[PDB]
Amino acid sequence: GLVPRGSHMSGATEACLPAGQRKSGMNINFYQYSLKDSSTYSNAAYMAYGYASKTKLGSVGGQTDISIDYNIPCVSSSGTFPCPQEDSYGNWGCKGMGACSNSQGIAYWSTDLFGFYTTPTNVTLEMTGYFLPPQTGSYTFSFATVDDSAILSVGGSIAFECCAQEQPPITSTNFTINGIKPWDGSLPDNITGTVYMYAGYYYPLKVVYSNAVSWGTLPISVELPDGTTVSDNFEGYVYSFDDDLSQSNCTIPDPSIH
Ligand SMILES: [Cl-]
Ligand SMILES: [Cl-]
Ligand SMILES: [Gd]
Ligand SMILES: [Gd]
Ligand SMILES: [Gd]
Ligand SMILES: [Gd]
Ligand SMILES: [Gd]
Ligand SMILES: [Gd]
Ligand SMILES: [Gd]
Ligand SMILES: [Gd]
Ligand SMILES: [Gd]
Ligand SMILES: [Gd]
Ligand SMILES: [Gd]
Ligand SMILES: [Gd]
Numbered sequence: 001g002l003v004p005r006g007s008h009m010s011g012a013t014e015a016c017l018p019a020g021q022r023k024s025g026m027n028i029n030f031y032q033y034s035l036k037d038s039s040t041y042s043n044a045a046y047m048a049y050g051y052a053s054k055t056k057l058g059s060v061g062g063q064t065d066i067s068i069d070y071n072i073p074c075v076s077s078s079g080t081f082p083c084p085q086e087d088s089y090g091n092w093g094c095k096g097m098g099a100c101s102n103s104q105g106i107a108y109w110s111t112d113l114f115g116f117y118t119t120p121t122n123v124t125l126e127m128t129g130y131f132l133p134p135q136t137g138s139y140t141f142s143f144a145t146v147d148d149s150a151i152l153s154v155g156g157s158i159a160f161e162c163c164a165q166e167q168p169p170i171t172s173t174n175f176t177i178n179g180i181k182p183w184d185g186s187l188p189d190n191i192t193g194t195v196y197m198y199a200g201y202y203y204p205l206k207v208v209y210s211n212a213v214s215w216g217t218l219p220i221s222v223e224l225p226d227g228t229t230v231s232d233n234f235e236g237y238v239y240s241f242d243d244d245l246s247q248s249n250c251t252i253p254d255p256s257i258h
Pocket of ligand 6: 069084085
C-alpha cells in the first residue's frame, strides 16, 4: 500500500503546524484561588476551564522549567527559611531549624512560581504551549505527586485549539492525566497518561494546577519513545506561538496520514 491507512476510528491525536514565529517555553497564567478552599478544585469543569472565571492575577511567558515545588517558610531561631515538607514535624518544626513560630495555615507571598509574585499557598495556574515530539511513538506524561489538584491535557481540541493558544480555555474534560483532588481523600502518586505522537507536529499542551494550603507540588515528567525521561526542564520540547486565528491550514486532525 502506497500510503499508511490511518489510525483506526479517527483515533489519532489532533496536532498543529503553526506558521508564525516560535518562542521557547510555555505561557503561565495565574488565577485567584481561595486559601483553604478544598472543594472548588475538585470539579472537572473548574479544572478544565472554570478557573478562568476567577480573577486573573497575571502571567509570565517563555517558561521551560515547569515542575512545581513550593515550600512554606519556617520562621525559626536562625531566621526565615523554606521548609521541605518531609522535614516538617510536630506542631511544628523543620528538621535542622527547631520549632517554627509561624502558622502553616495562612497565605504566604513568594516569587517561587516562575518568578511571579503571588501566593503559592493558594492559587491556580494554567500552563499552555505546544509539545514538539522529536521521535514518533508513545509518550507517557506523569505527575510524580499532586499537591493539591492538577490536570494535563494533550492535543488539538483537548488542550486548546490549534493557532489559538491565547484564547479563553476550551471546555474539554478529556484529560490526558486526571490528577483532580478527590472529594474523598486523594490519589496515588505516579499518575500518568500516554499519547501517541508524530515527530515534528506541534501538540497543544495544557497543565492546570491548584493549591489551597501551604506546600504545593507538581513534578512533571515525560517518557519518550526511546525510554528516556525528561523531568522538570522541558527546554527543546515546549514552545509558544502568538494566536493566528486566520491561518486556515493550522489544524492537522490526523497526523497519521498528513
Ligand atoms: Cl521562605
Ligand atoms: Cl530540628
Ligand atoms: Gd525546576
Ligand atoms: Gd530552575
Ligand atoms: Gd520551586
Ligand atoms: Gd521538595
Ligand atoms: Gd521557582
Ligand atoms: Gd526553589
Ligand atoms: Gd526552582
Ligand atoms: Gd476543534
Ligand atoms: Gd497543599
Ligand atoms: Gd519504558
Ligand atoms: Gd531546581
Ligand atoms: Gd499574543
